[PDB]
Structures are given as structure tokens and as C-alpha cells.
Design a protein around this ligand. Structure first.
Ligand SMILES: Cc1nnc(C(=O)NC(C)(C)c2nc(C(=O)NCc3ccc(F)cc3)c(O)c(=O)n2C)o1
Ligand SMILES: Cc1nnc(C(=O)NC(C)(C)c2nc(C(=O)NCc3ccc(F)cc3)c(O)c(=O)n2C)o1
Ligand SMILES: [Mg+2]
Ligand SMILES: [Mg+2]
Ligand SMILES: [Mg+2]
Ligand SMILES: [Mg+2]
Ligand SMILES: [Zn+2]
Ligand SMILES: [Zn+2]
Ligand SMILES: [Zn+2]
Ligand SMILES: [Zn+2]
Lengths: 278, 296, 258, 278, 258, 296
DNA sequence: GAGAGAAGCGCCAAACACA
DNA sequence: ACTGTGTTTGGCGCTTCTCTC
DNA sequence: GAGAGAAGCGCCAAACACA
DNA sequence: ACTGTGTTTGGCGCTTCTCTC
């Protein structure tokens, strides 16, 4: 019996076929097996993409990066415009809510006033001080899923680009002052370098004629939900957990009840399709 | 009526034409501040919706849409000028004016626009009615007119010499007949855009242009408002050929006011730029008289 | 809300009218606020003016290195606790990072801007430097704005006030004559040259194969044109009714079907 | 000047083009810049592939894997035949030269006598005891480049497969004895599971008719050498080192003189093409 | 070297002759070595015989669980320090892991092989178990081989000797009658059935696009046939002169050009 | 000569033919152990090189290669048998014998081999000369002959009934005329391979085969050597149809030796397998006489 | 004289790292 | 709302240009 | 009666982890 | 000699089969 053979040995589809079974029956035996699906690290789920603004100064991404220079650790606060890619970076001695506000205001003076900003839930971004500063300027601030740095991909990539340019500059003049290098790198990135795919600079996109209006949006999502095996983003696990039913699923993540009391948001990269127990 | 994007495509163009004709009705903002508020509001909504529609769809421009769009423009803009008053005042109808300007500007830049269809709907009378609007004291109107005339000149080929002659005539009238004009700063910018695209060798008509209507433009009392643009234009002309710069400096030294005045410094500024170009090629033919005139 | 915008920035009336405020409401806000009651260059980034200003405090002094464009009035200012040639270089570099590379710069004669270090800095970027011995209006505007901000809140870290002031006079206030903002006048793309005896054709955007995000599809659904391009996405009409911003990773450059 | 502009700002090709340069000149400016190439983490070099036997029992790959079970750490010695993929695995209490020899002899009894065997330079494989045991059986033993686990890809992948099956079995019977599970998994892998690409089991390949003789080999390699930027496999580095000239380059690695006294073997994945200084 | 092979394994003469040794040399090695001086089943893995043997040591005892196929004589033995039903199950599982799944197994009546646990183990694998109350030649061969190995080296960990003995009697020694080795007789694929009124066509190998390893190429150089397939590579003739084993990652399944 | 892979492909086939004819020379190993050592060594090298060549190239088999390859086989194998001697001895020419066997086996399995070209070069005389070699006392030769005859029977279609009649004749001669035969174990394996490929309904010729030459094969004194294979064959026959099993057991009970002998147990073994198949389908027609005969 | 090398130029998938 | 992304790089196809029989 | 749903089956690129 | 690899998986194209106007 293919069912008994798989229950004893957990052999694959081609093994079950030769002992007598059609491809569909062996395939259903594999699909209905909980042990196989909890322990196979493979899964096939869609990819998510960060939310991008409809026009300049609509959505921004911010992050803090460490840089080592002259036995001193500098904290670079970086803001990137999700439409044009324009970068504002400031170097500070430490990470603090006051420094976050100062860097945001410097970015506003450099680029403009953004409608929304989103950052990972860092200690200096969830403070009451930062929320009050954003609210006084009518800036709506949202946060990401914890322990998922890929949800801020654009700003992290910009951190890499900025640090690479800084290393290139310091390779020539080890005695070059930090602010000189940062200013030259910012000028190079925004005014000199050309974006790979649109063949235009960041500054050209940022000050392009705003004549094209904002395209309309739609808040309608899928009205159905499924069962999911899952892994918690914070702690990596060898085998999946669940399965459990999703309260609601957005484009890029879902609500999974992790325990009997609290639910949580999990991205599609840590979810695996299950089968309905009924 | 109904939203243009919520109807079948078979009659969508008909609804677009209906909304286009719905903007043909005029509204007076200067007569009284409060009159037909909801009519103005729905007109603003219709203009915004139409311009949002036009720049997100392709293959929507067809022959039965070409003429009356211009008509709508002619209905909204070609009109008698407000009385002169010599900070400048702003037109009370500016909301709808800005909507129609931005709509026309995006319409003229549509990738589906064909330049061979407007040759029977946009003619010299439209050019005159558009150019006469440059006298407006509203800087927004002048900026939009600059960015509109530039594209019209660039796209069309059979209406270039006519615009050049018309701007020569308006320069003559401004410099000789009537001094009252304020759309002079942007016209020189458009001219500089045209001059920069010249080839070699230069045509003698351009020499007539500079020697008749461009250099004499310095003897106007109101040069202070538009000193840089004019200067830019000559720098955009002499760079093509350094041989034809001697008449320029010869006339420039003659238009210099022999008496002390605050206006002198601007002249010096111009000379500096010319100097920064005239030093090479061994140009010392008029260096001595220039120094003699500068010393006094 | 224009009232909060004024109470935080103390900008001009044209700034309020550009927002939801009306002329009479803007005037009311003006007279209800207790605290508020030539172009020698030819092109943007052609000639700059560099000045050093002293900011007076109750028990300390600040040095403001200010660079102003002589075509748009665009202001780039940095605050320092001292003054030397290297700091002048740093301020010039920051001004370049915000505005761009100037062609010529102009300034007074002094210990800074005349040393060999500053000359070396200017020569490496190919900037011609001219010196003279004797605009001050921009300095006055900045001084009044900083004083108003400090009067509103004496407990400011002397950095946010400067950033807000630059934002106000660059992006919010409107130049009276041209009725434009300094930022928009400075960074507005200029009219392209018009070639003679050659029609100015319209640039054609390329064609792409695309995939719908969030579907885990693997077959590219036909080639289409792009309405707009930006950093990280392109506006692709998915159907004849709506359009969507598709990321580059889900796009593949194609050839026109002809 | 494009050369001066790049020397100051290190801008990209499209930036250098607009300041006046042909694509070739800007491309050569970028190629000849040392700072750009030492600091860009990108490189384009060929891929290597482990050496595979010409027939069954020609080359084997071995490795040790840890497994956790009943608060006890078991050491699985795994041997894989590089031609057929046949697996021999034995579970021991510790890793020792004696255990290595015992596992090798068990594998020989299970599968046969191999001509050559290669393993990573583990502590229990480089001992004199193991070399003497291999020499007594006329087994030639070679080792891999240190700190490069990918050079033993087949055996590491087999470790993953074996552990996945073990977890599947223990998911049902937590009280199942270890040797029972290992024997069932070995039977499933060698006799039941089917290889993905050749559509045959490992045992079918291992005992297939040996009628096809060994194809001939060629020891001829490339007679030319180049300059290379490099990174040391043991210690990761942000930026490249060098460049230096290769003493000789084989198919998959090269000799790079790391210091003035000792040279070393570096795989193609940690090398970057340079330009001749003369 | 056959001399070293005998001195380590003490195999038969046919084993030496299969290697470089000659008949007279093999006989000389035989008489120079001081220590050396029916089929009831129908198919392989059809009927097995299970026996338990006691190995005598100077101060301890070993239990050998031995399973022998009744068609090829293939031997699978495990050594234990005790004996019970679970250990019988473990030995059967190891024998299956080396040889395969038998159809029927045969053994004596005793505390093991008759308990409910062993019956449950056999039923889960669908193996029919029959019991009888009374081959012993295989036991004798194994005993002599272990004694010879221990005499050669008294300091053996009692595991390597068993592994070497199994290797010798399975892969090295040659059965006298059929002149084959036990391993080769056991694992030799059998003659496929011959369908009636239908020609036995030759199986056709598929066609692949391939790339040359070590070149960083990106264009697949045409489709070709495969001479041989194995785990991890396929034999592809790169030219009309030589062939190379190309890995699967550099291969792409194709369709015959027709 | 020269290596086959080191010549241009234009004349490579010619060199292959030359090496093929180079193996037509015979060498005697039984006459004296040492004679023409280097000739034998180069013959071994040539055989190994040719077989290594044939299995790594495609489109090398062509019509002018088809006949004489068989000729080479006929030159090396079709010969008088060594005198009978009743451990069995091994042929002294086994090295070259194994090389030529493996060469022919790989040649017959080449994917470029065409079964429609050997119909004019391999005929019934080749079949007889190949089958007569099954009497050899060398087990290696018998194993190779089994694996060769199986493929020849499988590939060809017009030579199947002839082989069946020939094996029936050899069974008759072995069971009645001469008892001296030792190639009986492998022949039954080939038969079982053929039987397993039968269809439904069974032909009456196969019934004649079992009732005439298969069941009587039990009354031979030398059944002990080939007891299992024969048994396998009948299990491969009665599984197709359980109705035709009664004659099998009826004859099986008659061939049972009525006296006590060690040979009895094998008979019982066969019955067990038959029992394991005969219990279903309510087969108790001959259960009582079978039990009566088993009791005695 | 003219078609074959040679330089030029644009495009791209795989790798890489952002705590 | 929740959600990965932008730049570097040897190889390739393709176009333009020059030295040779 | 017959073409449209529906089930069946084989193939595959991207992800994954092997300390 | 030095050198990454084999299995899982939802989606797709393609073939075979059944219920309906
Ligand atoms: C809750 C909570 N508390 N701590 C965490 C947490 O897990 N975050 C770690 C990784 C320290 C972290 N990481 C990054 C980051 O950028 N990672 C580098 C990267 C970027 C992209 C890519 F694809 C892979 C890696 C941040 O920006 C950051 O703020 N944090 C806090 O979650
Ligand atoms: C010298 C020296 N001393 N210690 C090292 C050393 O760097 N080796 C580490 C990683 C502990 C190591 N690792 C693996 C292993 O398999 N890694 C898991 C993996 C496999 C494949 C793949 F692609 C990525 C990761 C081993 O087998 C092993 O023996 N060692 C010693 O080098
Ligand atoms: Mg962060
Ligand atoms: Mg980060
Ligand atoms: Mg290891
Ligand atoms: Mg490992
Ligand atoms: Zn399972
Ligand atoms: Zn105020
Ligand atoms: Zn560089
Ligand atoms: Zn011996």
C-alpha cells in the first residue's frame, strides 16, 4: 500500500508510483502528509515590494548606519525618497530622538516636506518625541514588521552605496575630514551619478515637472483567507509551525494567530501554503 | 454628468467631447466674489478630471477631438486685457486659468499628438491671439505662455519665420511706439532657446535681428527688470562666430550713457562676460577705444 | 492648517494662500501674529556670493557661512563656532551638495577665501574665484527668521531653527516679482535649445514585458508602453482601464512589435 | 577633465560621459582606477565544480555531521560516491581517527573499495593514523582548500537530505531508536528514492553494468597567468587585496602569493580580474 | 599488490587471479601463508535465513545476528553484546539497508523472532515470517575469517574485523560453481521480460543544451545527445573527437531537432 | 599500426576495418603457455581500444562495417569444443575471449545499431553456431552467451520461433538421447524472460511446450544444479492462467519418486510456491489426491 | 578596389551587501 | 497597513571603420 | 451528436540549507 | 591537484476524458 509505505518511510512521489499508484494519488499523499511539509524547508510564495510614492515627497524611508573612522563611530541618518531616490544624509555622534528630529528637519530643508515616512521600529523612531515632531508637521509615520530589514530595502541599499563611496574617498586621503567626504559623496550621488534603469539622475527626477497628477488608488483587498505554516521572523526555526488560519491577508503579509491570545503580521517569505483540515 | 472612466470605451470619446464643451461656459470672478459657486466648483472638478484622464491613456487623441480643444482654449484665454494699473495684482480667475493652462500644456506634450493635424486648426491668427496675451501683468500667465510658445515653436515647422517677424514687430513697437510692456523677460528667454540651436554659417537675417532690434533694446529705461536674459542672448549669439563681435562692442560703447548714473554698472557686467570670451583669437582691434571709453 | 504652518514657520502670505488659506484669512493671521506685527548672474549656479555673518546670543556667538546664488537668491548656510579656511571649504562643499557646482564665486578679502588652501580647493573643482574689498538683504531675512524662531521657543538646539529657516525661505516664501519660490526658480529645468531646419521630435519611451506583483506568476504578459519612469518603478497600464507602478525587477526591456 | 573629475568624485561612466568623453575612454578610466576596483564587492569569475569519478568506486566524498537526539549529540560519518550518489552513513558517539577508519571500512563493506577519496581538512582526516590506513588499502587521499565547505558540495547536500529524513521519522516516533531510523533512512535513500535528473535510484547506478570503460583524461592546463585581486577564504574582508600575479592557475582555483614567503590556493569565487601594471 | 591484499584480507585464489596475480603466484601465496595452510530460494531477496551465532573470546562473548540470502549467499551480519527482540529488529533493518526488502524470512523458534514486537515489525514491512525447529556453512566461513583476522592482529576493536570479513566474502571471494562473487550475483540486474508480438526497441536518451565549464559563458552551444547519465553529470560529446562529463547545472533539457 | 582516434574522420572507418581484420588471427593458449607474447599483448590492446572507441561515438556504424564484425566473432568463437573432463576448469584463452565477448555485447547495444541490416548477415546458421556454444563448461562463456542470446532474441522478430524450436530440440536430446549437458541453468532463465512477456489468451504451442519438454525435465538426475530456475519458469507460466494448473500438478505428482531419497525435499519446495498461488480461485479439485500422495 | 579584422558601443544576468 | 533593492561587471550581438591582396 | 470544461500528467525555475 | 549541489514546489502547457444543449 502506497499510504502505508509512505507512512513508514516517507518516500518520494516516484518511489510511491512504482509500488502502484497514479501520479495524482501519490501527489495527494505527499500533499496531505504533515511530517513532510513541516520539515521541508522549501516553499513557493509570492514576493513583496515596499510601498512607493506616487510623486516626489510622498513617501520616504529612513535608517541609521554606523561608520568607523579615526577610532570614532559615526551615525549616519539617511532619508531616501521612494519616488526619485534622492538621498539626504547627516553624520552625528550618537543615535537619539533629538538627532532623529534634527536629521529629519535637515532632510526637509534639503528636499522638501513629505506626506508619509516609514522606518523600522528603532528605539529613536518609536519615541513620543519623534511622533510629536512628526504630528506638528502633519507627517504620518508608520513602522515595519519587526526583525525584517528587507521591508526597508531601498534605504538599506542606499546605505551600502553611500558607504562604498565613502570608502573610495578615504582610500585616497586618510586625513580627509568626514563632513567634506560626506558632502562630496552626496553631491556625486544626487547630481552626478545616473540611475541604472531610467537613465536619469536623482535630482532630475526630484525636480521634474510635477504636471502628471497623482494616479488614483484602490483599497480593495482579497476577501478570502487560507491556512498557513509559518516561521516567526524574530527567531529562526528549523521546521514550520502551524498550520493556522489567517484573519486577513494583505498584499505582502498576513495576520497569523501565533498564540491563543495575540496575532501577528508575517511576510509572505516566511509563510507556506497548507491544506484545509476540513 | 458622469465620470469619463466609468463608461464603455465605445462612447467614452463622446463624453470627453461633452465635458470639453462643458468648459466653454464663462464665469466672472471680478464682477462679484460670490456668484454661481457650485458651477465654478464643478468646472474645477471637470478640468482636474479631464487632465488626469488625458495623461494616463494612449490612443485617445483622434481627429474629431483636435479642433474644438483649441476652441475651448480660445474661449477661455483670447479676451480683452484687464485695465492697466502699473506688488503686482493677480487675476481673480486664476484657479480656472491655471487648470486650463496645465491641461493645454499636457495636451500639447501627449506622445499621441500628431503635428500634421494641427496645421489646419492652429494658424497665424491663433499665434497672434496667443502672443498678444504676453502683455499680461500676471507673471503666472507669462511663465505659462513662455512654456507654451516654446513647445509650439519647436513642434511646428511652417510657423517659425512668422513668429520671428512678429516678435521683431513687437520689439519695434515696444522700443519706439509704446514703452508700456512687461512680457519682455520671457520673450528673450525663448529667443535664447532659439538662438542656441543655430548652425554654421549664420544667416544674415540673424545679423539684421541683432543689429536692429537686439542691441538697441539697451536704450530703454526699464532694462533693469530684464538685464540678464538679454545679456544671455548675446552670449548665445557671438559664441557661434567671434568675427562678428566688433559691431556688437561698437554699438555697446555708443549706447553707454555719458553721464553718471546707477544704470552704468549693469553695462560693465555685460562687458565682463564679453571680455571672458573676446580675449582669445587675438581680438585687440577695438581694445584701445574700449579702454578709452571705459576710462572716462 | 495654515494657522499652524504660520505658528511654526512664520512664512509669508503667498505661502499661506498657496495652501488652504484665503487672502483675507492670511491677512487676519498676519495681524494676529504678535511676532509678525538686481541679478548680476545670468544663470543658476553661475555666480555666487559668499558672506560671513555673526549671530548674537545672550552668552555666546555663532558664525554663519552663507552662500547665495545671484540669479535666484537661493540660500545655503552653515553654522560654526569658529572660522578658518578649512571651514570655508566645508561650507562651500555643503553648498555644492545642496545647490550644485558654481562656475564663479565672489567674496571679500580676509584670512579665509584668500589662503592657499582655499585656492587649491577651488582649482580642484575648476571654480574661478574673484576677490573684492567694499547681498546683505538675505542676511537680514535670515537674522529676522532666526530671531522669530528663538523668540517662539528659547530652548532650541540652534540647528533645527537654521534648518527650518532655510526650508521657509527656499520652499515656502514666494519671491514678490516673479511670484515663484526660490527653490522652484533655482531648480526649474530650462528651455532646451531648438535646432534649426530640424523638427523637434517627441522622445519615445521604451516597451516592456511585465508581470503582476503578488501573483508568483512566471509568464510575461505581453509588451506594453510606459507612461512614466522613476527610481524603482515604471507606470505600466495593466489594462485599458487602470495603470499600476510595476517595479523594475518585474520588468524586461523589449523591442517595439512594429 | 574626466580624469580629474573621476579622481575627485569617483563618479560612474554615464557621469563621465556627459562631461565629455567617449564610452571607451570613460570605461578605461573606470577600469584603470584602483580605488573603484578594490572597493566594489562585485566581480565576474567562472564557477567551479567538484571532481567526479569516471565510474563507480573511483572518487568518494566524506564528512562528519552532528545530530541532536535524546540530549545526546551523535556524529554521523557520511560517504558519498561521486558517480552514483550512493550513501553510507554510520552514527558514533564522538569524532576520532579510529571512528573515521571504522566508518571507512564499513562504507567499503557496504559499497566497495574506492580508488580516491577527498575530504575537508578535518582534525581526524589529516592524522597519520588515517593516512596509514588509507595507504594499506591503496587509497589515495586528498584534501580541500581550507575554509571552503562548498568544495565538498555533494557530501554536504547529502548531509542535509539525511538529516531531513531523520527529522521526518522522529516526528512520528520520538521513542524510535536511532539505529532503526538510520537504517530505514539509508534504505529509503539508496533503494527507494529516485534521483531528480537521471530518473534512477542510487543503487541502480551503483550496480549498473560496468561495460562502458573509463574515458581518457588530459592533464593539460592553461599555460598563461594573470593578475588578481583576492580575498582570503578563512577571514572575510570588506575590500579586495592585491593585485598580485598568479604562479599558475588550474581549473577552479589559482596560486596567489599572499605574502613575500608563502603562496596559497584561492578558488575563483574569491578572485577578481585585474589589469597588468606594465 | 596481491601479496598485501592476501596479507590483509586472506581471500581466495580466484580473488588474487582477478587482480594482477597469476595462478602459480596465487598458489605460492597460498602455501606461503602460515594462517591459510542447494538454493531453496528462487530470486534474490526472496527467502532469507536468520541465525544467531556466539563468538568466543578469551574473557568475553559476542552475539552475531546473521542474515543470509538463499539464492546468492549474500551475508549481512551485526555484532551485539546481548540479544532480544528489538535487537533482532535492528539487525533485520540493517540487513534491509544493505541488501533490500525480503519477501519471506525464515528462522528458528526462540525468545526473539517469535514475540509480538517482531511480528509487528514484519507486518509493517509486509514480510511473511515462518518458524521451524531443527545455513551453517556461512557461519563457519565467517568464524574462520574472524579468527584469522584476530590472529593477525590481537589488538582489533572487533568492528573493523567484521567489516573486512563481510567485504571479503561479499566482494572478494568467488563462488566456485558459478565463478562469480556474492555481491555481483546478488545485485546483478536480471533479464527484462520480452513482450510478445512487439519488437524490443532501444531506449533513446534525451537531448541537451550545454555550456563548457570554467568559461563563464552565457550562450548554450547547440543541442547534443548524451552518451551516459549519472548522479550529478552527463557524458556529452563536446566535439567529434572527445567527450566530457558536464554537470546538470550547465545542462538544459531540449527537444530533438527532427 | 596507429590509434583510431588520431586519424582524420575521412579514413577513420578504414582504419577501424583494418583493426577489425587484425583480430582475425588466432592464438593458441593451450598448445604452450609462452608463444608470441607480444602478438597477444597487441591483440589485447587493440580489442580494448576498439571497444573503448565504439561506446563513445555515434554515427560510426555503417553498412560496410556490418558483415565482417560478425565474421570476426565467427572467427573467434565458432570452433570445436574442448574435450570433456567432467572445481571446473577455465579456458586458457579467456583474456581475449572476454575482450571479444564484451566488444560484441556493447556493439549489439549501440543506439545506432539498426535491426533491419542484420537480417542479411545474421541468419539461422549463426543462431545454431551460437547455441551450440552453450555446451561449454566455462561458466563465464555461458553467462555471456545468456546475455547475448537474450538481446538477439529481443531485437529480432523473424528468428524467434526458430530459437524456440531449436531449444525444444535440445531439451529433447538432453532429456532422452544424451544426458551430458551443463548449459541448462541459463537456458531456463532466458525462457523465463520470454514467458513473462506473454499475453492473453495463451497460445496452445506454449501448452505443448510445458506438457512435453518442461514438466518431464524433472526426471533428470542432475536437476539439483538447476532446480530454482526451472521452478521460476513454471511460476512465470501458471500466473497468466490459473485454470491450466491442474495438468501441472497431475504430472508433478506422477514424477514424484515413490522411494525415500534426498531429492524429495526440492519437490516439496516447488509445491509450496504453487500452493501460495493455487489456494485462491477455489482450487480443491486435486487437493485430495495431492494430500494422499503427500502423506505417503 | 573590396571584403575581411578591428574598434566602438549598448545591453544584460548573476553576484553582492545593506548590523 | 503589512511587503527587498540598486550598482558593478566580462561576455555577447551589432555597428562602424581601416589596413591588405 | 459534439465541442467545451475538467481531470490527468510531465516539466521547471526559484528558493533553501548543508557548522 | 585546486573547484557547490540535489530536492521541494505551485504554476504552466498539454493531453485525455466526461457531462450538457
Ligand atoms: C525589533 C528589532 N530589534 N532589532 C531588530 C532587527 O532584527 N534588526 C537588526 C538586523 C539589527 C537591524 N537590522 C537592520 C538592517 O538594515 N539590516 C541589514 C540588512 C539590510 C537589508 C537586508 F536585505 C539584509 C540585512 C536595521 O536597519 C535595524 O534597524 N535593525 C534594528 O528587530
Ligand atoms: C581549516 C578549517 N577549520 N575549520 C574550517 C571551516 O571553515 N569549516 C567550518 C564551516 C566549521 C566547517 N564547515 C563545514 C560545512 O560543511 N559547512 C556547512 C556548509 C556546507 C556547504 C555550504 F555551501 C555552506 C556551508 C564542514 O564540513 C567542516 O568540516 N568544517 C570544519 O576550516
Ligand atoms: Mg535600522
Ligand atoms: Mg538597515
Ligand atoms: Mg567537515
Ligand atoms: Mg560539511
Ligand atoms: Zn510524509
Ligand atoms: Zn507669524
Ligand atoms: Zn575611481
Ligand atoms: Zn592468507
Amino acid at each position: 500500500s502506497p499510504a502505508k509505505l509512505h507512512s513508514f518511510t516517507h518516500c518520494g512521489q516516484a518511489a510511491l508510483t512504482l509500488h502502484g499508484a497514479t501520479t495524482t494519488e501519490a501527489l495527494n499523499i505527499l500533499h496531505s502528509c504533515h511530517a513532510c511539509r513541516k520539515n521541508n524547508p522549501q516553499h513557493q510564495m509570492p514576493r513583496g515590494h515596499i510601498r512607493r510614492g506616487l510623486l516626489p515627497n510622498h513617501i520616504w524611508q529612513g535608517d541609521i548606519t554606523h561608520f568607523k573612522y579615526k577610532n570614532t563611530l559615526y551615525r549616519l541618518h539617511v532619508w531616501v525618497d521612494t519616488f526619485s531616490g534622492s538621498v539626504s544624509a547627516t553624520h552625528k555622534k550618537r543615535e537619539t530622538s533629538s538627532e532623529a528630529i534634527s536629521s529629519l528637519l535637515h532632510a526637509i530643508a534639503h528636499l522638501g516636506r513629505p506626506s508619509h515616512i516609514n522606518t523600522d521600529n528603532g528605539p529613536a523612531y518609536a519615541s513620543q518625541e519623534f511622533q510629536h515632531a512628526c504630528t506638528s508637521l502633519a507627517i504620518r509615520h508608520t513602522t515595519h514588521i519587526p526583525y525584517n530589514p528587507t521591508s526597508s530595502g531601498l534605504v538599506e541599499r542606499t546605505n551600502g552605496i553611500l558607504k562604498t563611496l565613502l570608502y573610495k574617498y578615504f582610500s585616497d586621503n586618510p586625513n580627509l575630514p568626514m563632513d567634506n567626504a560626506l558632502s562630496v559623496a552626496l553631491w556625486t550621488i544626487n547630481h552626478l551619478n545616473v540611475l541604472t534603469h531610467c537613465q536619469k539622475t536623482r535630482w532630475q527626477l526630484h525636480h521634474s515637472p510635477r504636471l502628471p497628477p497623482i494616479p488614483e488608488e484602490k483599497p480593495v483587498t482579497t476577501s478570502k483567507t487560507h491556512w498557513y505554516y509559518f516561521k516567526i521572523p524574530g527567531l529562526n526555526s528549523r521546521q514550520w509551525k502551524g498550520p493556522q488560519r489567517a484573519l486577513q491577508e494583505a498584499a505582502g503579509a498576513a495576520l497569523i494567530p501565533v498564540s491563543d491570545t495575540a496575532a501577528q503580521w508575517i511576510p509572505w517569505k516566511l509563510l507556506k501554503r497548507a491544506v484545509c483540515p476540513r | 454628468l458622469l465620470h469619463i472612466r466609468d463608461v464603455p470605451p465605445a462612447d467614452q470619446e463622446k463624453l470627453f467631447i461633452q465635458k470639453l464643451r462643458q468648459c466653454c461656459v464663462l464665469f466672472d470672478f471680478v464682477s462679484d466674489p460670490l456668484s454661481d459657486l457650485k458651477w465654478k466648483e464643478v468646472k474645477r472638478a471637470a478640468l482636474s478630471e479631464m487632465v488626469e484622464y488625458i495623461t494616463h491613456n494612449r490612443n485617445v487623441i483622434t481627429e474629431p477631438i483636435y479642433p474644438e480643444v483649441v476652441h475651448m482654449f480660445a474661449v477661455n484665454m483670447f479676451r480683452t486685457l484687464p485695465p492697466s494699473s502699473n506688488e503686482p495684482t493677480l487675476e481673480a480667475a486664476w484657479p480656472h486659468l491655471q487648470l486650463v493652462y496645465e491641461f493645454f500644456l499636457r495636451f500639447l506634450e501627449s506622445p499621441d499628438f500628431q503635428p500634421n493635424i494641427a496645421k489646419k486648426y492652429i494658424d497665424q491668427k491663433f499665434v497672434l491671439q496667443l502672443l498678444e496675451l504676453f502683455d499680461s501683468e500676471d507673471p503666472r500667465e507669462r511663465d505659462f505662455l513662455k512654456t507654451t510658445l516654446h513647445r509650439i515653436y519647436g513642434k511646428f515647422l511652417g510657423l517659425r519665420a512668422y513668429i520671428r517677424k512678429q516678435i521683431n514687430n513687437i520689439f519695434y513697437r515696444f522700443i519706439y511706439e509704446t514703452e508700456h510692456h512687461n512680457g519682455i523677460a520671457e520673450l528673450l528667454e525663448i529667443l535664447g532657446s532659439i538662438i542656441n540651436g543655430f548652425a554654421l554659417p549664420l544667416k544674415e537675417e540673424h545679423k539684421i535681428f541683432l543689429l536692429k532690434v537686439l542691441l538697441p533694446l539697451h536704450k530703454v529705461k526699464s532694462l533693469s527688470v530684464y538685464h540678464p536674459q538679454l545679456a544671455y542672448c548675446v552670449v548665445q549669439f557671438l559664441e557661434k562666430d567671434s568675427t562678428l563681435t566688433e559691431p556688437v562692442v561698437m554699438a555697446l560703447l555708443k549706447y553707454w550713457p555719458k553721464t553718471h548714473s546707477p544704470k552704468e554698472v549693469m553695462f560693465l557686467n555685460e562687458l565682463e562676460e564679453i571680455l571672458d570670451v573676446i580675449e582669445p583669437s587675438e581680438f585687440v582691434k577695438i581694445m584701445e577705444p574700449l579702454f578709452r571709453q571705459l576710462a572716462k
